[PDB]
Design a protein around this ligand. Structure first.
Ligand SMILES: Nc1ncnc2c1ncn2[C@@H]1O[C@H](COP(=O)(O)OP(=O)(O)O)[C@@H](O)[C@H]1O
Ligand SMILES: Nc1ncnc2c1ncn2[C@@H]1O[C@H](COP(=O)(O)OP(=O)(O)O)[C@@H](O)[C@H]1O
Ligand SMILES: Nc1ncnc2c1ncn2[C@@H]1O[C@H](COP(=O)(O)OP(=O)(O)O)[C@@H](O)[C@H]1O
Ligand SMILES: Nc1ncnc2c1ncn2[C@@H]1O[C@H](COP(=O)(O)OP(=O)(O)O)[C@@H](O)[C@H]1O
Ligand SMILES: Nc1ncnc2c1ncn2[C@@H]1O[C@H](COP(=O)(O)OP(=O)(O)O)[C@@H](O)[C@H]1O
Ligand SMILES: Nc1ncnc2c1ncn2[C@@H]1O[C@H](COP(=O)(O)OP(=O)(O)O)[C@@H](O)[C@H]1O
Ligand SMILES: Nc1ncnc2c1ncn2[C@@H]1O[C@H](COP(=O)(O)OP(=O)(O)O)[C@@H](O)[C@H]1O
Ligand SMILES: [Ca+2]
Ligand SMILES: [Ca+2]
Ligand SMILES: [Ca+2]
Ligand SMILES: [Ca+2]
Ligand SMILES: [Ca+2]
Ligand SMILES: [Ca+2]
Ligand SMILES: [Ca+2]
Lengths: 257, 259, 260, 259, 260, 260, 258
């Protein structure tokens, strides 16, 4: 039980790997901005496009257009996968709303070219109407409700009836609703949010998160009655390149002119 | 084994569900070197964040359990069942819920000292007849959080809990509050908890990290089963890290400091 | 199979351990001088606290049984079945219930000496036809706790318990009282307990800690099972602490002394 | 080899109904009995064991819905007459009218042992020279009657085969509280298997370190072959080997009464 | 395998041993000069006591089957199937019952010699044409014991038993007698017994101790089941002990001397 | 793991191999990258074409159990022969006097228009955007009852175009207007495209290259489909070659049945 | 799996061996493609006696099926499926039954040659549309035995068998004849048999002794089941003796003449 080296490791333990997102060297370079826009040919984006296809089917089964993105631990890319997925879904001619439920460390507004004025934090206490809430981002058909000002009681705010009101509104007013949450192993927040969502997906970093960590995470959700559809393996990289193997294998399918 | 529980997995594999894993707070242990309530004193604390996780687990667990009364019992003395209990009720009140804590430890109980309440006409006096059930509840330094302290130490604690006056009080509390939390003495020390357990809808057991043994936990659970008291799970209190690369081998606790 | 060292030993064999009574050093001191109840003399004692635990599990098991008569029998002599019996009745009386103890040990019974009563018109006299069943019960030094002592030692104890006059007394005792406790001689010594067991609703058996063997316990139970008397469980008396890491091994005992 | 424990038989699906110790008083007062131990030494552990057998018997007969009991043994001189006579004696002491029929028309001596004449006994009754009602003779023990063997016939097995035998047992059953039939050993003569057809409960005696498990199994086979159910086995003449804290198979406690 | 050494050997393989007849030294002596029949000559003999045990087993087995006809067969020749048969009938007549023995061994058969009867108009004659089924039975030296001897040796014994005249005789015998015993030749030598077996209600098989093998016994039982003839059990004849002990293995002889 | 060396390898893992296409030495020669010409036309006697004829026979039965005349041809990885198998299959199906339409859904690297002899004007790309009517779409190829809708001009959003309701409608039209519809798609392990297309098809078949694709690769591919509710009928093993010639054995065996 | 040397090998793998045809030394000698039909040339031959056993097995096997059409297919080429087929039909006609043999091997068929028939207007032609069904049938050198030969080699045999005209012919043949036998090319070489199999009531597979292996039989049955064609069993052709003993091992045969 070390850092997950293969999607098969968790697949064999009855944990379905919904997507295996490679490490984008373009993003890695820029970090030292939205990739779906910056470099749309990227294998990470092509993997997120696969995730969108898997989701469409998985959400027709759930019949609820709300989806939660949670992670195992902090800084594994759950905000990266979430923002880029919403971006890719909007490109399918669908009105997408992203709710940044990370009222502790959320920075969607910054990443999506939006102000943090009258965000989720404000909406939840009362100050700020639910209908007005949504803010347009640098991407067409993609709107965002940022975290708002950092509250002293994030978990307690999500516990309110005002949160269920907002999610219900969002569900009615948008084609798809994505909720970015803080990691389950750090704070309870995601479990609280999970009560209102129809589909839950969990991010795990490639050679970093352990099978025990993943199992513990999924346990916390079950314990609170939240079904998790599957796991997303982010920041995967090639090791033993053979004829593309080690469980990963990804092909450069470059279009013609 | 017959050695201190080193992992939640140890008791999970033996068919004992670990509902929460509370870390050892240094703020408490240092500001105790029991003193100040952590949930108020230091609300950012990892122990409080873990207790908030327990609150989330509880909400779901009792919906099916059906009875807003919850009992908190422990394996042995000084493991932190009063700490978990008081701090849980504090965190539940912060959810805009009417929380009543009943201190059933009429032997060593001190919740009234913790929560800033007098011990006049407590459980002891209100169980002997000396006080009225409706008047009983006392407001604490925390909003939406009320307490019925132990009262004066009686010569017959187990015998008082055995009375019909106890069932009357719990029934009242259930009707008058959103949630009822009952702090009891450890099961392995005194029978008290097994008497109280008859009136509760959900029972949770605290066990200290590298201190309580699997045999101790197994024995405790047996005493409850023997008295027809179902235990929903176990809470692992005072957990500490033993590693330092990709948090943290057997147990993991991440600090997600707000901006 | 050598002295029982753990409740788990017999637990694993199907034998339910209902209570594990520690060795009271207070009682040990007061004997080395039985005489005078421990439940009264030193009520804070761990043995009494263990006895209180037994009362709690008792309440449940007897509600299920549908009868208020409970027999206390042992495996062998001098294991503490009279000790557990008298102290349990004492502790049950403290629960605000009208409780009666019948001393069915017409051979070596001495409850009358323990509880402070005369032996006049004792069980012996009642069974022969001399004394009236309604008058029988005698008040003890403990409130809401009554006793029918053994009487003068008869030549035919087993034969007296075999009479219809015994069933009549137990029947009366069951009516009139909230709980009926019957102290009997050990099953492995004399047949007496197996005769008494026909009239009872819940049967409990005492076994001494590092003294009685699993084979002894199994044999005891087989005698009852052969006479159609179901035994609810076993009580492990005179348990003593051996280890000192995480309190103990087997049964760990905590000294929960009250505040102010 | 000789059955060293009750557990040996019990593990082979043979229930041990009682374990009668060796009577130190009876061996002394033999050095064919002829004193009944139940009378001469009533405190004896062998009798206390026979009293336990009486307790097992009632209930096992007040569930069989029959008052007739047969006592048979594996081999000669194991104590089946000893257990039988002493058991009847102990049952009569329970204020019950007991009849003992001595079906050992070969070597029977109950009349010598219980102080009765052998005039117009079982032998005579079956030949058709003596009335079934008149039959019963009072013994030296109150409420205890006996039908002795009578004069030794040339055809014992043939006489028990008669309808006169079934008539007598039926009469005995109607008149008396309990009917005990002492018979010769099954492994020696067929007699017991003939008698067994009229009894409601059958018990088999086996001598402690003498009779073998094979002998017991063979005996039980002969009965089931003749449709006679055997309720259990009685281990007679048991002795203590090493002291320890009661030892190997059997257990003995000297619970002597006060003055 | 080997000559059977224990009744348990048979019983282990599922073969019920109905009786274990010891070797009669009295017979052995009166043959080394059969004889003037053991049941009469020496009635106290252990062999006769064993045959009496067989009679007790039979009474239950036959009145359980509701048919008074019994066949006695054997595994191989000269094992004592005629010895066990004649002596059993003798012992059954002593129970005040009218017994008829039919000698179905029409090749070798010698009961009329042993029971002092003439061989005029025997089974052979009855089966061919006439001798009159009703007249057939002849009185033996033993009261309540009648015999139909083999008759003159026919050239077709198996063929005669195959006739409807045989079934007629057995049916008559069943109606006119309390018990019918049919002595047959060994199954492993001739088919005769399997033909006779169709008309009988109970079948018993004799096997010589230390001589007949388990394979022989199994083969014999197979031939019967192949012909739908149920065999109750096996009789172990000519048993002897291999020096005392506790009496073991399998065989135990207890002399139970009458005294007057 | 290592490249699949036997159809049995997959078969033992519960993956039904539907066809085992040999390596066309004729095709390998004419190629010298991309497929030079249609082998079904170029060399119709070729063992690869005979194997594709076997696939057609398997399909006829399998397609009609499904009731839907639309079939998708997807592969594990690029350059394994899924376009080769697809085009050649449709060619051999048209030879069965059936109206076949091939839709090249590879709007990234598609070249069916080059291979079949068609212009790329107003292709799938254009149709999906609006720049073409669905009912005009189909283009006749160099082969008889065989029509093709080529990729069209390379769009910047291929997966997004297949996601449209305009795609669903084209497939529905094609199904109504043709005897059967074959859809060539890009590899599943490279791009999501095939999983989008799979929603509209009635039968899905997957190509895997002989000693190249691994069992892990095949299992991963099949997982992606089931995750999107796309049932895969089986796997096609393309480019199989011999190592032996003993009795033709060691996984695969193919016979040179030359006509007279 | 090193070339079936026993009927038991197959039997143990749940594949029923319907017949075990020995190697005819008369035929082996006459062949130095089969020269002429053995059931006529040497009727006493053990191979023909084995084929008579196969006829007895089929009678029962075909009552079960209800359809009088039977297909003979093989694992690989030159194993004797044409030999078994022609000789079986010959032996069935000798049971005074009207037998029709259809040569579905439009690739390498030669039944017209060995049976003494012209190849004018064969199956190839009939399928093409030119040539009437009711005329198709040609009498052979054997009484009650008719044949419809392959015709001239077509460029599309698998495609011709795929036609509705084939189903029409089989249906006619069934309605008119007592028994219909269809000789096909090997399943492991060409798809032809799997196409034909849809119209037949009973399918039997030939496998050569010492040759053909167990994996070949396995993959041969697999291909049929994949196309919903039930195979009743396997025929082991060209079996030969190994020992010169006193009776055994896999096979054992006796010369039962006067
Ligand atoms: N697949 C990836 N390839 C390259 N960089 C990545 C990838 N996933 C995440 N990152 C980077 O990792 C960092 C943390 O990602 P983030 O979405 O903020 O994590 P989290 O939501 O878990 O707190 C960012 O700088 C992000 O660009
Ligand atoms: N998770 C924790 N971190 C730090 N100190 C703790 C923790 N839990 C309990 N304690 C400390 O343990 C001591 C006793 O706790 P208490 O609640 O009185 O135990 P109990 O009721 O189980 O007898 C106090 O010093 C309390 O602050
Ligand atoms: N748990 C105990 N601790 C101390 N002394 C005990 C305990 N149990 C029994 N004893 C002592 O053991 C002795 C015998 O007990 P008793 O009740 O008379 O036994 P029994 O009825 O089984 O013959 C008494 O002196 C009693 O005080
Ligand atoms: N438990 C016993 N203790 C002492 N002597 C015994 C015991 N059982 C039997 N005996 C003696 O054994 C002898 C034979 O007993 P008996 O009843 O006559 O045997 P059986 O009926 O088997 O013939 C007698 O002398 C009897 O007193
Ligand atoms: N148990 C026995 N003891 C002594 N002799 C016996 C015994 N059984 C049989 N015999 C003798 O064996 C001989 C053959 O017996 P028999 O009944 O004639 O055998 P079978 O009917 O098998 O031919 C006779 O002389 C008989 O007396
Ligand atoms: N069985 C085969 N035998 C010979 N060449 C083949 C075979 N299968 C595929 N090829 C060749 O492989 C190359 C790639 O095939 P292609 O159909 O374009 O693959 P894909 O669509 O999987 O990317 C072409 O040159 C094709 O002719
Ligand atoms: N059992 C046999 N004994 C001797 N020769 C045989 C046997 N079976 C087949 N042959 C010969 O071997 C060849 C097998 O080819 P054939 O019967 O035409 O069928 P196919 O080639 O279709 O498998 C023929 O030449 C035939 O004479
Ligand atoms: Ca984040
Ligand atoms: Ca406490
Ligand atoms: Ca006592
Ligand atoms: Ca006797
Ligand atoms: Ca004979
Ligand atoms: Ca392609
Ligand atoms: Ca051919």
């Amino acid at each position: 039980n070390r850092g997950i080296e293969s999607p098969q490791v968790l697949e064999e333990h009855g944990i379905s790997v919904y997507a295996s997102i490679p490490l984008s060297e373009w993003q890695k370079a820029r970090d030292s901005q939205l990739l779906a826009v910056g470099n749309p040919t990227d294998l990470a984006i092509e993997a997120i496009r696969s995730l969108r296809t898997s989701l469409h089917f998985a959400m027709m089964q759930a019949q609820n257009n709300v989806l939660m993105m949670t992670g195992v631990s902090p800084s594994i890319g759950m905000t990266f996968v979430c923002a880029n997925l919403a971006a890719v879904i909007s490109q399918t001619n669908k009105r997408v709303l992203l709710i940044d439920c990370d009222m502790r460390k959320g920075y969607t507004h910054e990443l999506l070219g939006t102000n943090n004025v009258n965000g989720l934090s404000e909406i939840l206490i009362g100050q700020g109407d639910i209908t007005t809430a949504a803010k347009p981002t640098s991407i067409a058909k993609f709107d965002l409700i940022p975290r708002g000002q950092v509250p002293p009681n994030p978990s307690e705010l999500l516990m309110s009836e005002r949160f269920a009101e907002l999610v219900n509104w969002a569900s009615k007013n948008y084609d798809l609703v994505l909720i970015d949450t803080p990691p389950i192993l750090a704070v309870t927040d995601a479990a609280i949010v999970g009560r209102h969502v129809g589909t839950t997906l969990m991010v795990a970093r490639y050679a970093v998160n352990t099978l025990k960590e993943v199992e513990t995470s999924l346990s916390r959700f079950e314990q609170n009655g939240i079904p998790v559809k599957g796991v997303i393996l982010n920041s995967i990289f090639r090791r033993a390149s053979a004829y593309q193997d080690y469980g990963y294998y990804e092909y450069e399918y470059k279009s013609d002119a």
